Structure 1
């Protein structure tokens, strides 16, 4: 009779009966399942009471909305959105359904990958970001835990970035651009830094800029790339300027030392690709956005250009719990 059924997977998933054989894959928590109507495997993500606070509410709502503003194979697209609750007063949970993938990009980064695989992943990450930029969306918080891959090397970005306080048991900040670390103005190529942080981790198999807080993180950036030029300092607020100028200076190691040929593959082809990879890196991991490569110029770097012309409820302010609940509920039921 009822359209939904419930299964305990530490959380309770109450889902439509078309979705069967639920099992955990990652932590909103996400299950894999078989969709009997579409005859294919899907992923299901549960948002529990996303209206419970402004952080969860703002992200749930904008990401629900922004779905309909994007249609790109490298960007998440939803197959289904539902709530088992029957009315606004009873509304609690949102379920989101998408194509089931094979792995998270974190897992992929731990593997040795040939240049064909690495360069195609990056090409796709750059297409996605370019498509987001075309639709007036600048991510600013791209990181591998929110990117998923299929065995055929195809990739999808699952989130839409920054618009705080978290009352729960943490956010990953290591892929954020200096503009974000230091609170500067930004433009599209803020997202290139993140790609470069991913690319470099693919090579080194270690997070490039770890740290407890932005303090450590910035140390790691300067120690490795050197202190930026005065033209960069002038773009900083006077208070963060004082902070940055008074940190110990650093000459900054060259990129051959940062990514030596030992981390790259036996053939002239691989020798040439390694130098092209290092080159792209050195253009992406550039502290000053004025001298950092753009999405378009990156897409035509020789490392990347081997992979196609075909491949070219607005954001709201602060609301209360009850208003967010209604905004989100309405979106779920168009």
Structure 2
């Protein structure tokens, strides 16, 4: 009660611990509004995300639960940490909302994408994304839904991934699918380098300042992919389920564009010999990530070692000890209790 106070943030009531002051909306996502606030105790700014009845359905519940668990057992500079978590409700019966408190970053990657970046900053951002992704992989977490809106940065070019990736809900909210790999689009099996496709899409967009494959649905998405990259080889076709294979084979054939035409020198710093070489290397990396057939696409480790990226390589960041994580299907009440226990640090 008196340890909390309430403020109206648009159509959301934020009921927060008194230590958190001067709340201001910084944006919204799949789980609602996120605010910046000042933590009067730590004497610094924080982000506060409100999860409103996260147990209301299985999609929300599994995400909230997985986020709480993973944020706690991961400690890596490129993965967002949990500073605090609380509920203003006093019991399991009364339990409604979860508030997740994290260190405040300066912007998301969507903002960075709207800016020209030199090779130093671009390569460093990419290196960090790759480090974060590899760390998740080392715990057996394959993201599958990496996107700019869930990646945040500081003015000093430091970067953190906010979510842990991969349905029906009764909401006007539309999930952005533009960064998802062909394996995901087409319902194939996948491995770790599924996430490299997403890095490729983000890198391409950082370079050309436009979404590479902005499809209204998976059918339109696939069209945009093959238009740009070309129809995949017969070898790839055999990897597909019969129903998917007939669909992919019956689409109009496209030649695709060379990576020189997709990403011309004009989109890169390319004045000096230094910059010309970097542009060539950047394009080479793009040509290895934006590869439809995952069996020919670069691995995370190969990307970390790539000449465009490896200038930043540090074993403490790229080869950190794997997180130790301590398939669930539950009802509303079951999820409610699981999430409450996790918030309250109960067994």
Is the contact between residue 139 and residue 191 of structure 1 (CA under 8 Å) also seen in structure 2? yes
Is the contact between residue 226 and residue 250 of structure 1 (CA under 8 Å) also seen in structure 2? yes
**Partner of residue 71 from structure 1, selected from 51, 62, 75:** 75
Cα RMSD (Å): 1.6
User: Over residues 175-197 of structure 1, what are the superposed CA-to-partner deviations in whole Å (9 max), with x where a residue is unaligned?
Assistant: 00000000001000000000000
Is the contact between residue 5 and residue 14 of structure 1 (CA under 8 Å) also seen in structure 2? yes
Shift of 1:68: 2.5
Give 3-state SS (helix, strand or coil) of 1:38's partner.
coil
Paired with 2:72 and 2:13, the residues of 1 have a C-alpha distance of: 28
Shift of 1:313: 12
Aligned counterpart, 2:343: 332
Is the contact between residue 144 and residue 195 of structure 2 (CA under 8 Å) also seen in structure 1? yes
**Partner of residue 132 from structure 2, selected from 128, 134, 138:** 128
Shift of 1:316: 3.9
Evaluate the alpha carbon distance shift between residue 179 and residue 231 of structure 1 in structure 2; reply closer, same or farther with a 3 A threshold. same
Q: Unaligned stretches of 5+ in structure 2? A: 316-320
User: Over residues 181-238 of structure 1, what are the superposed CA-to-partner deviations in whole Å (9 max), with x where a residue is unaligned?
Assistant: 0000100000000000000001111100011100010001001111111111111111
Which range moves more in the overlay, 107-116 or 66-75? Answer: 66-75
Evaluate the alpha carbon distance shift between residue 79 and residue 88 of structure 1 in structure 2; reply closer, same or farther with a 3 A threshold. same
Paired with 1:115 and 1:313, the residues of 2 have a C-alpha distance of: 35
Is the contact between residue 255 and residue 278 of structure 1 (CA under 8 Å) also seen in structure 2? yes
TM-score when scaled to structure 2? 0.94
Give 3-state SS (helix, strand or coil) of 2:64's partner.
helix
Shift of 1:29: 1.1
Paired with 1:72 and 1:243, the residues of 2 have a C-alpha distance of: 42
Is the contact between residue 127 and residue 311 of structure 1 (CA under 8 Å) also seen in structure 2? no
User: Over residues 67-125 of structure 1, what are the superposed CA-to-partner deviations in whole Å (9 max), with x where a residue is unaligned?
Assistant: 22311100010100000000000000000001011001100011000000100000000
Is the contact between residue 23 and residue 31 of structure 1 (CA under 8 Å) also seen in structure 2? yes
Is the contact between residue 73 and residue 323 of structure 2 (CA under 8 Å) also seen in structure 1? no
Shift of 1:315: 9.8
User: Over residues 120-152 of structure 1, what are the superposed CA-to-partner deviations in whole Å (9 max), with x where a residue is unaligned?
Assistant: 000000000000000110000000000000000
Which range moves more in the overlay, 24-33 or 313-322? Answer: 313-322
Give 3-state SS (helix, strand or coil) of 2:257's partner.
coil
TM-score when scaled to structure 1? 0.97
Aligned counterpart, 1:209: 213
Count of paired positions: 333
Please give the residue correspondences for 1:142-291 in structure 2 after superposition, counting only pairs within 5 Å: 142-162=146-166, 164-169=167-172, 170-265=174-269, 266-291=271-296
Is the contact between residue 139 and residue 322 of structure 2 (CA under 8 Å) also seen in structure 1? no
Shift of 1:324: 0.6
Is the contact between residue 65 and residue 313 of structure 1 (CA under 8 Å) also seen in structure 2? no
Shift of 1:11: 1.2
Shift of 1:312: 11
Is the contact between residue 179 and residue 202 of structure 2 (CA under 8 Å) also seen in structure 1? yes
Evaluate the alpha carbon distance shift between residue 37 and residue 31 of structure 1 in structure 2; reply closer, same or farther with a 3 A threshold. same
Paired with 1:263 and 1:237, the residues of 2 have a C-alpha distance of: 38
Q: Unaligned stretches of 5+ in structure 1? A: none
Evaluate the alpha carbon distance shift between residue 88 and residue 313 of structure 1 in structure 2; reply closer, same or farther with a 3 A threshold. farther
Give 3-state SS (helix, strand or coil) of 1:289's partner.
coil
Aligned counterpart, 1:24: 25
Is the contact between residue 72 and residue 82 of structure 2 (CA under 8 Å) also seen in structure 1? no
Paired with 2:326 and 2:113, the residues of 1 have a C-alpha distance of: 33
